Amino acid sequence: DKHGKFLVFFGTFVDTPKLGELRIREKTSVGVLNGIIRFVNRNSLDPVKDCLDHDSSLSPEDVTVVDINNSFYFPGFVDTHNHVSQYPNVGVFGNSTLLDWLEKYTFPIEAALANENIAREVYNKVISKTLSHGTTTVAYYNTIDLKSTKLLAQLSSLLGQRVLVGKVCMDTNGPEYYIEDTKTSFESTVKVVKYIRETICDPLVNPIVTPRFAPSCSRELMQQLSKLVKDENIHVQTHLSENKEEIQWVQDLFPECESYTDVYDKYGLLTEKTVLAHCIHLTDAEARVIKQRRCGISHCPISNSSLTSGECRVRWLLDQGIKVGLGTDVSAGHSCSILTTGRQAFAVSRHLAMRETDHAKLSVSECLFLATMGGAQVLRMDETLGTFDVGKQFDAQMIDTNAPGSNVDMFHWQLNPPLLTNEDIIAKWFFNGDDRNTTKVWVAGQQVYQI
Amino acid sequence: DKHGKFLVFFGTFVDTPKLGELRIREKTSVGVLNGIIRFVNRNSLDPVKDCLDHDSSLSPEDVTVVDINNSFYFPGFVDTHNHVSQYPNVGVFGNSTLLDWLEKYTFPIEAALANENIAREVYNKVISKTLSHGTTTVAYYNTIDLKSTKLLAQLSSLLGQRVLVGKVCMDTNGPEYYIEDTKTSFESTVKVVKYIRETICDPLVNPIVTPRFAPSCSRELMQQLSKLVKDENIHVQTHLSENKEEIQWVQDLFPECESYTDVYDKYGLLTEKTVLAHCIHLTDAEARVIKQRRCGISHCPISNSSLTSGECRVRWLLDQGIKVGLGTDVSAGHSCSILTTGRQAFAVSRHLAMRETDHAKLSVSECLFLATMGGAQVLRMDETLGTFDVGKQFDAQMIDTNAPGSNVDMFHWQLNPPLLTNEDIIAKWFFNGDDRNTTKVWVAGQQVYQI
Ligand SMILES: O=c1[nH]c(=O)c2nc[nH]c2[nH]1
Ligand SMILES: O=c1[nH]c(=O)c2nc[nH]c2[nH]1
Ligand SMILES: [Zn+2]
Ligand SMILES: [Zn+2]
Secondary structure, three states: OOOOOEEEEEEEEEEOOOOOOOEEEEEEEEEEEOOEEEEEEEOOOOHHHHHHHHOOOOOHHHEEEEEOOOEEEEEOEEEEEEEHHHHHHOOOOOOOOHHHHHHHHHHHHHHHOOOHHHHHHHHHHHHHHHHHOOEEEEEEEOOOOHHHHHHHHHHHHHHOOEEEEEOEEOOOOOOOOOOOOHHHHHHHHHHHHHHHHHHHOOOOEEEEEEEOOHHHOOHHHHHHHHHHHHHHOOEEEEEEOOOHHHHHHHHHHOOOOOOHHHHHHHOOOOOOOEEEEEOOOOOHHHHHHHHHHOOEEEEOHHHHHHOOOOOOOHHHHHHOOOOEEEOOOOOOOOOOOHHHHHHHHHHHHHHHHHHOOHHHOOOHHHHHHHHHHHHHHHOOOOOOOOOOOOOOEOOEEEEEOOOOOOOOOOOHHHOOOOOOOHHHHHHHHHHHOOHHHEEEEEEOOEEEEEO | OOOOOEEEEEEEEEEOOOOOOOEEEEEEEEEEEOOEEEEEEEOOOOHHHHHHHHOOOOOHHHEEEEEOOOEEEEEOEEEEEEEHHHHHHOOOOOOOOHHHHHHHHHHHHHHHOOOHHHHHHHHHHHHHHHHHOOEEEEEEEOOOOHHHHHHHHHHHHHHOOEEEEEOEEOOOOOOOOOOOOHHHHHHHHHHHHHHHHHHHOOOOEEEEEEEOOHHHOOHHHHHHHHHHHHHHOOEEEEEEOOOHHHHHHHHHHOOOOOOHHHHHHHOOOOOOOEEEEEOOOOOHHHHHHHHHHOOEEEEOHHHHHHOOOOOOOHHHHHHOOOOEEEOOOOOOOOOOOHHHHHHHHHHHHHHHHHHOOHHHOOOHHHHHHHHHHHHHHHOOOOOOOOOOOOOOEOOEEEEEOOOOOOOOOOOHHHOOOOOOOHHHHHHHHHHHOOHHHEEEEEEOOEEEEEO
16 A cells, blocks of 8 residues: 555656557656646656655655666556456357347357356456556446446455446346336436446446447447436446447438437437447448547447457547547457557557558557547546656556567567667567566556556 | 486377367376387377386386376467567667668668677577477578577577577678678578588477568568579578568569569569468459468468568468468567467457458468468478377477466356356466466477476
């Protein structure tokens, strides 16, 4: 417990304050107190003194120095879309696309998690594992089950991860064994919001209203949830425009609306704090509504490729001023790692570019931005998360490119044969790094994970 | 050294004898003697006796049992295309596409490896690292340097990996600091072939004639190499139809030919043992020539995506009877892992499918096939490699899905909540496995790697 203890981290700090830039600050001291960054001084020669200089009420005994060659601090990753409840099925989907995959794998496993023993095991695994890949903040879709969603929020609080925890709402078009009625779906959402806000009462743990997607939610349910969302100022997360059959289904189910996006817009679910997952097949008009309502987009490339859903036009969305983050979308996406997700966003943008132009391509720096600040923007937490800056939360991971077992190698003579830049080193971690390189993770200035 | 020692491996054996099938043999004994599989008996109750039954000249003392829950044997991966010399640059390529990437990164690093100290370090790293990812057989492009190519072949022999080692030939369109003249390029190829065949004299180490690609090789050089290849019955490897600017360049450079493929065909380099890397933008006519000449194709998805080269139409090539393997294509591809390569081949086939049909999609089983047998077919070694079958080489890796640090998790209750098949377990390793799950590697019935 670091609360009340003035921390100063010294070393190399890497982050992405603006899309496309990679800020590398060597020999830098970052002061952290009660989870908040108090100063960032480049070329610190005296980290303790940097603290004493910052606050004269401090003495050397009040300061804890943390000493970071091959190693840097990077912001915690933000996973804007993760069905923790589906984790048992990562890698398991065969040749299926979305709607068959829902029927065959997802409703079965989500229902199975009504058993608290299974859920508790799954939740502990996924929180620990995403932490070990550097994910400090995650928006979790759970299941329709109230009790298990509360437990997920409890264990999130316990383990120190920053989360939004959603009870999934489904009152239409689900199997009888895995469906709610409208009143239950709404009221259990009210309860879960209350329990998280008033009982869990933890700044790291937030509720999020989770209409599964338009085919699963009646007009009445969506309007009720929308009123809850407006009155209680709650985040929202749902899927949008992922798969063409899904899109056709939505059109068939809501012919009074202009588009899938218009369904959510008309029944009140598009807000500054709505996280829209996938958003592949959007029309220009749909993207314009999303912009006007200031919703954020969770880009889930692994899922989109594995389910043959399509290619998210990330550049096209960014070019319109829509904020974009990354989501693992477990389990449609097999990986718990936003780093892995980032690498695939990089690849997906190039499949697009092969037919569009180079413009569609995302750089390493941009994907890392999406993996951190982008997600914070989507969650509307970018004033407090995503970069090493004064006032922001110390959500951070230590990256050691020479941690044991690392696939990120560098030869001494790279650091007149060609030499690596600092940017190159970051790119080697981006492409070949994994959890083994994330050796420590901090959330809110607390260490929550140690390799 | 296991030579002269009758080995029997007992456990679960997974392999892909035919495209699309995943053969899982539990409680199976595989007898291995002097690198060759002698029997495969499903439901072995007595592995020692299975050996005594196989060969009455044996006694219990002559038999060494190797005992494999979460673990199976899988064939060693085949990397049909790897520029070991470019390894220092994995992850390093920025926004570049092929021709800029050659100029900016590849010729510089390849030239740098004329320094034997650097090369020795690189070769030891890459052989050890590809072994640790389960790559038992690899076709290596080195550099134009004779001495370093010999060393690569020496260290390959020393470390136990099965390799084809190519001295790169370039006598045109290269920078003055990294080019050969025609006579040197040919004669150093003759020498390297001789040195490998007659001095290294190791069944695991083979030469391979390596014209870099058509723009780098004069008509005279190609014809000389073609005659060498015919007279000495040597493998060939080159790049084909990777990047549209490259393709235009070839057309401009060889306007007397009908196509890029026709350049290699006319000057004699298309043979049953020619490994053609990439082969993205082939016309129907080009693919037909490749079929008629019985060349194999190295599919290098990571490179193809990272350099925005395009999407290899793997299904379309397979549908024509052309054999396809996987290649990492270090360093245009950042990964040394054919497993990683396989996962990306899986993804690339789905980007294709999004616009073609489901037909273009590769299953998990098919990618694993490409990763093993496919590569063996491309190298024309599939009678002796790629599967656990009698007469074939014991090129094999032990996969432990619960090795330390594994990202392949399974809950006990997955092995009435939904249960995993054996195929599902393999798919979880396919999508979330990495080198940490490859705990032992055997080449030619010798253990060459231990985690
Ligand atoms: O990627 C997704 N995962 C899901 O569980 C889901 N449900 C509806 N739509 C969905 N998309
Ligand atoms: O993927 C590739 N890597 C290379 O070094 C190369 N050279 C020519 N063409 C090439 N393609
Ligand atoms: Zn989802
Ligand atoms: Zn290559």
